[PDB]
Design an enzyme around this catalytic site. Structure first.
Site, short mmCIF file in Angstrom:
data_model
loop_
_atom_site.label_atom_id
_atom_site.label_comp_id
_atom_site.label_asym_id
_atom_site.label_seq_id
_atom_site.Cartn_x
_atom_site.Cartn_y
_atom_site.Cartn_z
N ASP A 1 5.59 -2.97 -5.96
CA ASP A 1 5.32 -3.51 -4.66
C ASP A 1 5.60 -2.46 -3.61
O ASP A 1 4.77 -2.25 -2.71
CB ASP A 1 6.15 -4.75 -4.46
CG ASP A 1 5.58 -5.95 -5.16
OD1 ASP A 1 4.43 -5.88 -5.72
OD2 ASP A 1 6.31 -6.96 -5.19
N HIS B 1 -1.76 -0.87 -7.95
CA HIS B 1 -0.78 -1.93 -7.87
C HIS B 1 -1.06 -2.95 -8.97
O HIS B 1 -0.14 -3.36 -9.75
CB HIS B 1 -0.87 -2.55 -6.49
CG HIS B 1 0.16 -3.61 -6.25
ND1 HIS B 1 -0.19 -4.91 -5.96
CD2 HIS B 1 1.51 -3.58 -6.27
CE1 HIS B 1 0.90 -5.63 -5.78
NE2 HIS B 1 1.95 -4.85 -5.98
N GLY C 1 -6.02 -8.08 -2.78
CA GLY C 1 -6.06 -9.53 -2.56
C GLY C 1 -7.04 -10.30 -3.43
O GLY C 1 -6.73 -11.35 -4.02
#
Lengths: 121, 121
Positions: free
Chosen positions: A89, A47, A29
């Site tokens: 994802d 990721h 995040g």
């Protein structure tokens, strides 16, 4: 796009993606990458490096199709970028699930000055 | 960039920006805009519309300079886009502070998919 990502994360982990991963460690995040604090954080690192590989599409913005088939995230794209994006994802969602066992709330809202420089992708 | 945005939010509201505003209601955080849940959320809504006006800079990634002068965010000259960006960020931080009184934690980590479509900016 982040919508699919978040959905996948919810589907894999069963966790609200924002609460658990919207700011976790140095990579989840938060802006950019940092030395992962733990396996969960490492998922997000991977990721983000996954995202950095993409050419042809916008990982944040571009929607793509996927399916939930036999409780598996099934990417539904042939376009190479969107497929890889979807797979990025999917991989993170799975990874996050797989590492719930060492998820540590103390890394929620981890402060950036405690992040060491990330290894290059 | 998110760094300055979060810092301004911290400075204006006294709150950890990620925790309080990283995912709040339909507009604060990722996933664009949606009909706002409350005044705090409307701050982020206006914020997102503010961003749409920007040309020539990246609200997420482009860092810019501002100063804290007389306990006020003072956007640096930067360049026109960055200054406008800075002003978007400053405004949301101010707005979030002004509306802290009605901050409702129930909207923290609000599932943005469960947001009615936002009106055009």
């Amino acid at each position: 796009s982040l919508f699919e990502l978040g959905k996948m994360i919810l589907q894999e982990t069963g966790k609200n993606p924002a609460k658990s991963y919207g700011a976790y460690g140095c990579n989840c995040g938060v802006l950019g990458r940092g030395k992962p604090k733990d396996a969960t954080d490492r998922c997000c690192y991977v990721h983000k490096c996954c995202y950095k590989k993409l050419t042809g599409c916008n990982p944040k913005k571009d929607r793509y199709s996927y399916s939930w088939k036999d409780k598996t995230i099934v990417c539904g794209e042939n376009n190479p970028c969107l497929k890889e994006l979807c797979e990025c994802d999917k991989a993170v969602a799975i990874c996050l699930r797989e590492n719930l066992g060492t998820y540590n709330k103390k890394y929620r809202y981890h402060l950036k000055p405690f992040c060491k420089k990330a290894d290059p992708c």
